[PDB]
Design a protein around this ligand. Sequence first.
Ligand SMILES: [Ca+2]
Length: 121
Amino acid sequence: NIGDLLGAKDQGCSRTCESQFCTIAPLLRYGKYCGILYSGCPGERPCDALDACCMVHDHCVDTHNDDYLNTMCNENLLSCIDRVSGATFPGNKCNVGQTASVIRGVIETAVFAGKILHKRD
Ligand SMILES: [Ca+2]
C-alpha cells in the first residue's frame, strides 16, 4: 500500500472545514470528513449535517476492518444523506445539495458492489 510509506492517530487528518473539488468525486474534500481517503482528527466536530454523515461512515469503515464495501456502513450513509438539513459552515464554497448528490452516487455503487460480493460468497 502507498500509505505504508507514511510516515499515528492524531496525524494525516484534517482539523479544517474544506470545500475543494465540490463536483469531482475522486478529489472531493468537504468539511473535515467528506471525501475519499480524507478524514478528521480524533475528537474533531463535523462542520455540518453532511460532514456528520461522512464522519459516521469513516469510523464505520475503520471499525469493520477497513471494508469500504460494508453494506451497513454504506446504506446508513445513504439514509443520512437523504435527511441532511440546516446551516452549513461559513466559507463553504460548495453547494450542499450538489455535493451530497455526488457523494450519494459513489455510495450507491459501493452498496451494489458489496451486495454482489456477498450474494456470491
Ligand atoms: Ca472521508
